[PDB]
């Protein structure tokens, strides 16, 4: 088509997309239609002459919508990794219409500047800033896997220069075999991957009761490993674990890493966004010790998933995505972004409130952010049983996890549209099905 | 923001995009801005309260628009890695709203691959409509698709020699594996070889830059006689350098009787086989094991579009199939064929201006959409020309080396290149040519 054809249909699509996102409350979260349903609803060959815009859209409703998940719904109570906000859409449209540094000066320079905005919001210490401070600085990365690996490698080269200056006899090959990296037991798998690819030994540190790495567990490991003749050169401290909202004590672990020449990489994951809010910055005291810091701004700052921000204490050791950041940050503002996260933590506690009040359910981990780790008091069996009925119903979606030897339900409030109305309706549904589940147990 | 806000600014953005696209002739193809122009124009911190959409777009015009390469420009006469049409834009808006990475994903894929298969008049072997084993999938890029092929081949050959000799270890077999491609073949092949950890050898092309039966078999014998093991082989229709075509009918029977996986890469020109005039160049696919090309290049799908069929599926992220569906229904087979033919035509228009002129020469046969031309004389003269051109900033070309000869390429692959753009450009070449000829005299 030509341009002013596109003015019309584009403006129509805006409308279709608007309505979907308004009435999405009514859609069923999981597709209630079976593999193979689609072939016989559509012509076996392409049309010769163009179909109308009018007829295509209707097919979108009638043929496409039934066969789609609709993750964007308030009742999808898990993290939706490819979610996008409205500003992110607006940007996407433009980012598409445009399509190295020398290729795109703006794309590159915007990245550096947005990194600084992000920086300040989180109030990282000043060394981290790209603001021509000439020390530290940050970068966007494809994944939080990339990021962990980058710091790992940087960590490894560093230790080999320092150990080989020490004794010019030792080979790089001899050193590498002794290298050990650490992470909590609730470490993201992206740590294992990193260490695997970087060719070193990865060991878990036992988490404390609240699933935080607590130094005594770290120090022992250190002692056990320095004494078997291994070498510790790197470690991931996770803030906001993906299992639950667990936070590694940075204030105890940091000081140790400094003293033992262990590179400190802080994986804040998703939770990191929450440090734009003062109530949470205390979970981030200790960053002073870290050598790198990485988080995904997608879940709470509404930015494109494509983007994983990472900073470093020294720059020497180390798609048009900055445009969306720019839009989203500009269109919500820090306060809006703040109000956004805050609105979710409050629904998250609201839900916790509901679970405490019922004596058949327990809470497993202190509820700090959006997610609530709960379960039905009794066997893992009972609970496996219960998750099954919820998904079988196709009214809400929940994912589980295991803490220790315990099966857990994760209720996570991340969607842009969620209200306490939905949380209420979600609880009660869970409530009812738990009654039916409970009957069955006794048989 | 909220829904109804999207409504207002969603529409304004529609407009903004229209204008840009309408007034794209006015832009300069490559941004001309100094290192570090942006920062001073952006504030030091994020705003505390929301800015205005008015102020945001204004800043796109002022701050962003000078610092971007305008790839859509009809004057950007190189291959643009993103072909963006208007229906493609519309599916993006919907894929936006129904996040994807669901029975409708997998199924609309299978069906559009059958659609595209039927348009390319592929053997039924490669279609799943018949209920045959053959079927198609959509990949990220050709470089991925080529890798997915190679691996599938390495697996196959491994499971096959180990079936005949259980004492043989994967390790020992890999050491001897050999894959091949034309000496015009896209790097995406060398890269795949490094990841796949097999040896890669190049087959010498002919007068027309085509891989032929003689050279290929020469190579295999050489390498079999070394005790190496051929397993994979890449045939290229529409090469990167000059748009040449490996001889598929010659080469396909060889691979079969040599028990070699035949992957047929047509990344660029694959789209034109939906025209009956060009389908012959795809003859021999019958012999292939996997065929691949990029429609996002020339059929007006958005960039993350790749397509690859295999005869055997058991040999083998985004909602890409909704963008194809949209494009196809909005253009219809006719309209697409038309789009392809228009390019070819202005390609041939440019060819005959250059022949019309006695100071130039054509280097390779002008099959479809790319023209490889040259100022008569020394490479040196020709490097000057591209240096004017590229300096001028009026139009932009990417050259290449065909064997020894320096060659200027001229791609017509833009949604809105018209007959006029081709003449305004050729005038601008001749001007600069006469100059470079004047400096040759001194
Ligand atoms: Cl989180």
PDB file of N, CA, C and O in Angstrom, chain B residues 359-360 374-389 406 408 432-441:
ATOM      1  N   UNK B 359      31.794   4.460 -22.419  1.00  0.00           N
ATOM      2  CA  UNK B 359      32.894   4.553 -21.470  1.00  0.00           C
ATOM      3  C   UNK B 359      32.762   3.516 -20.363  1.00  0.00           C
ATOM      4  O   UNK B 359      33.698   3.331 -19.579  1.00  0.00           O
ATOM      5  N   UNK B 360      31.599   2.869 -20.276  1.00  0.00           N
ATOM      6  CA  UNK B 360      31.377   1.838 -19.267  1.00  0.00           C
ATOM      7  C   UNK B 360      31.271   0.431 -19.878  1.00  0.00           C
ATOM      8  O   UNK B 360      31.400   0.250 -21.094  1.00  0.00           O
ATOM      9  N   UNK B 374      30.921  -0.961 -14.429  1.00  0.00           N
ATOM     10  CA  UNK B 374      32.346  -0.659 -14.398  1.00  0.00           C
ATOM     11  C   UNK B 374      32.764   0.391 -15.441  1.00  0.00           C
ATOM     12  O   UNK B 374      32.363   0.321 -16.606  1.00  0.00           O
ATOM     13  N   UNK B 375      33.591   1.347 -15.030  1.00  0.00           N
ATOM     14  CA  UNK B 375      34.197   2.276 -15.972  1.00  0.00           C
ATOM     15  C   UNK B 375      35.285   1.523 -16.707  1.00  0.00           C
ATOM     16  O   UNK B 375      36.110   0.859 -16.073  1.00  0.00           O
ATOM     17  N   UNK B 376      35.270   1.606 -18.038  1.00  0.00           N
ATOM     18  CA  UNK B 376      36.263   0.916 -18.864  1.00  0.00           C
ATOM     19  C   UNK B 376      37.646   1.420 -18.503  1.00  0.00           C
ATOM     20  O   UNK B 376      37.845   2.634 -18.389  1.00  0.00           O
ATOM     21  N   UNK B 377      38.590   0.498 -18.303  1.00  0.00           N
ATOM     22  CA  UNK B 377      39.974   0.869 -17.966  1.00  0.00           C
ATOM     23  C   UNK B 377      40.532   0.145 -16.751  1.00  0.00           C
ATOM     24  O   UNK B 377      40.332  -1.064 -16.610  1.00  0.00           O
ATOM     25  N   UNK B 378      41.234   0.874 -15.877  1.00  0.00           N
ATOM     26  CA  UNK B 378      41.873   0.260 -14.701  1.00  0.00           C
ATOM     27  C   UNK B 378      40.999   0.317 -13.448  1.00  0.00           C
ATOM     28  O   UNK B 378      40.238   1.276 -13.250  1.00  0.00           O
ATOM     29  N   UNK B 379      41.124  -0.710 -12.606  1.00  0.00           N
ATOM     30  CA  UNK B 379      40.448  -0.736 -11.311  1.00  0.00           C
ATOM     31  C   UNK B 379      40.577   0.601 -10.608  1.00  0.00           C
ATOM     32  O   UNK B 379      39.627   1.083  -9.970  1.00  0.00           O
ATOM     33  N   UNK B 380      41.763   1.192 -10.754  1.00  0.00           N
ATOM     34  CA  UNK B 380      42.134   2.414 -10.068  1.00  0.00           C
ATOM     35  C   UNK B 380      41.144   3.547 -10.382  1.00  0.00           C
ATOM     36  O   UNK B 380      40.618   4.204  -9.459  1.00  0.00           O
ATOM     37  N   UNK B 381      40.859   3.736 -11.672  1.00  0.00           N
ATOM     38  CA  UNK B 381      39.884   4.732 -12.096  1.00  0.00           C
ATOM     39  C   UNK B 381      38.588   4.492 -11.325  1.00  0.00           C
ATOM     40  O   UNK B 381      38.022   5.419 -10.713  1.00  0.00           O
ATOM     41  N   UNK B 382      38.177   3.220 -11.318  1.00  0.00           N
ATOM     42  CA  UNK B 382      36.918   2.781 -10.739  1.00  0.00           C
ATOM     43  C   UNK B 382      36.826   2.970  -9.239  1.00  0.00           C
ATOM     44  O   UNK B 382      35.736   3.199  -8.707  1.00  0.00           O
ATOM     45  N   UNK B 383      37.960   2.879  -8.554  1.00  0.00           N
ATOM     46  CA  UNK B 383      37.986   3.146  -7.118  1.00  0.00           C
ATOM     47  C   UNK B 383      37.817   4.630  -6.825  1.00  0.00           C
ATOM     48  O   UNK B 383      37.249   5.002  -5.802  1.00  0.00           O
ATOM     49  N   UNK B 384      38.303   5.469  -7.737  1.00  0.00           N
ATOM     50  CA  UNK B 384      38.083   6.919  -7.647  1.00  0.00           C
ATOM     51  C   UNK B 384      36.584   7.228  -7.720  1.00  0.00           C
ATOM     52  O   UNK B 384      36.047   7.991  -6.885  1.00  0.00           O
ATOM     53  N   UNK B 385      35.929   6.620  -8.718  1.00  0.00           N
ATOM     54  CA  UNK B 385      34.519   6.858  -8.980  1.00  0.00           C
ATOM     55  C   UNK B 385      33.700   6.605  -7.721  1.00  0.00           C
ATOM     56  O   UNK B 385      32.991   7.491  -7.241  1.00  0.00           O
ATOM     57  N   UNK B 386      33.842   5.412  -7.159  1.00  0.00           N
ATOM     58  CA  UNK B 386      33.115   5.073  -5.954  1.00  0.00           C
ATOM     59  C   UNK B 386      33.450   6.066  -4.846  1.00  0.00           C
ATOM     60  O   UNK B 386      32.623   6.315  -3.958  1.00  0.00           O
ATOM     61  N   UNK B 387      34.658   6.635  -4.912  1.00  0.00           N
ATOM     62  CA  UNK B 387      35.113   7.617  -3.912  1.00  0.00           C
ATOM     63  C   UNK B 387      34.476   8.994  -4.068  1.00  0.00           C
ATOM     64  O   UNK B 387      34.223   9.685  -3.075  1.00  0.00           O
ATOM     65  N   UNK B 388      34.206   9.378  -5.312  1.00  0.00           N
ATOM     66  CA  UNK B 388      33.386  10.542  -5.565  1.00  0.00           C
ATOM     67  C   UNK B 388      31.987  10.269  -5.037  1.00  0.00           C
ATOM     68  O   UNK B 388      31.529  10.908  -4.086  1.00  0.00           O
ATOM     69  N   UNK B 389      31.330   9.307  -5.678  1.00  0.00           N
ATOM     70  CA  UNK B 389      29.987   8.880  -5.331  1.00  0.00           C
ATOM     71  C   UNK B 389      29.803   8.870  -3.816  1.00  0.00           C
ATOM     72  O   UNK B 389      29.028   9.664  -3.261  1.00  0.00           O
ATOM     73  N   UNK B 406      37.805  -4.850 -10.168  1.00  0.00           N
ATOM     74  CA  UNK B 406      37.014  -4.015  -9.268  1.00  0.00           C
ATOM     75  C   UNK B 406      35.665  -3.754  -9.930  1.00  0.00           C
ATOM     76  O   UNK B 406      35.601  -3.443 -11.126  1.00  0.00           O
ATOM     77  N   UNK B 408      31.632  -1.994  -9.523  1.00  0.00           N
ATOM     78  CA  UNK B 408      30.582  -1.242  -8.851  1.00  0.00           C
ATOM     79  C   UNK B 408      29.261  -1.973  -8.978  1.00  0.00           C
ATOM     80  O   UNK B 408      28.861  -2.346 -10.069  1.00  0.00           O
ATOM     81  N   UNK B 432      30.156  12.700 -12.303  1.00  0.00           N
ATOM     82  CA  UNK B 432      31.383  12.349 -11.570  1.00  0.00           C
ATOM     83  C   UNK B 432      32.363  11.525 -12.415  1.00  0.00           C
ATOM     84  O   UNK B 432      33.580  11.614 -12.251  1.00  0.00           O
ATOM     85  N   UNK B 433      31.817  10.724 -13.319  1.00  0.00           N
ATOM     86  CA  UNK B 433      32.630   9.930 -14.214  1.00  0.00           C
ATOM     87  C   UNK B 433      33.452  10.832 -15.120  1.00  0.00           C
ATOM     88  O   UNK B 433      34.666  10.682 -15.202  1.00  0.00           O
ATOM     89  N   UNK B 434      32.787  11.770 -15.793  1.00  0.00           N
ATOM     90  CA  UNK B 434      33.479  12.742 -16.648  1.00  0.00           C
ATOM     91  C   UNK B 434      34.635  13.469 -15.901  1.00  0.00           C
ATOM     92  O   UNK B 434      35.725  13.663 -16.464  1.00  0.00           O
ATOM     93  N   UNK B 435      34.387  13.834 -14.631  1.00  0.00           N
ATOM     94  CA  UNK B 435      35.412  14.385 -13.711  1.00  0.00           C
ATOM     95  C   UNK B 435      36.598  13.443 -13.571  1.00  0.00           C
ATOM     96  O   UNK B 435      37.739  13.833 -13.791  1.00  0.00           O
ATOM     97  N   UNK B 436      36.322  12.205 -13.166  1.00  0.00           N
ATOM     98  CA  UNK B 436      37.374  11.207 -12.948  1.00  0.00           C
ATOM     99  C   UNK B 436      38.122  10.921 -14.262  1.00  0.00           C
ATOM    100  O   UNK B 436      39.309  10.618 -14.258  1.00  0.00           O
ATOM    101  N   UNK B 437      37.432  11.064 -15.387  1.00  0.00           N
ATOM    102  CA  UNK B 437      38.073  10.945 -16.692  1.00  0.00           C
ATOM    103  C   UNK B 437      38.950  12.153 -17.002  1.00  0.00           C
ATOM    104  O   UNK B 437      39.994  12.009 -17.649  1.00  0.00           O
ATOM    105  N   UNK B 438      38.492  13.338 -16.583  1.00  0.00           N
ATOM    106  CA  UNK B 438      39.291  14.576 -16.649  1.00  0.00           C
ATOM    107  C   UNK B 438      40.587  14.525 -15.811  1.00  0.00           C
ATOM    108  O   UNK B 438      41.641  14.972 -16.295  1.00  0.00           O
ATOM    109  N   UNK B 439      40.514  14.003 -14.576  1.00  0.00           N
ATOM    110  CA  UNK B 439      41.718  13.778 -13.755  1.00  0.00           C
ATOM    111  C   UNK B 439      42.657  12.683 -14.324  1.00  0.00           C
ATOM    112  O   UNK B 439      43.879  12.707 -14.076  1.00  0.00           O
ATOM    113  N   UNK B 440      42.085  11.737 -15.080  1.00  0.00           N
ATOM    114  CA  UNK B 440      42.867  10.698 -15.774  1.00  0.00           C
ATOM    115  C   UNK B 440      43.768  11.297 -16.861  1.00  0.00           C
ATOM    116  O   UNK B 440      44.922  10.886 -16.999  1.00  0.00           O
ATOM    117  N   UNK B 441      43.219  12.268 -17.607  1.00  0.00           N
ATOM    118  CA  UNK B 441      43.939  13.084 -18.609  1.00  0.00           C
ATOM    119  C   UNK B 441      45.134  13.893 -18.026  1.00  0.00           C
ATOM    120  O   UNK B 441      46.174  14.065 -18.688  1.00  0.00           O
TER     121      UNK B 441
END
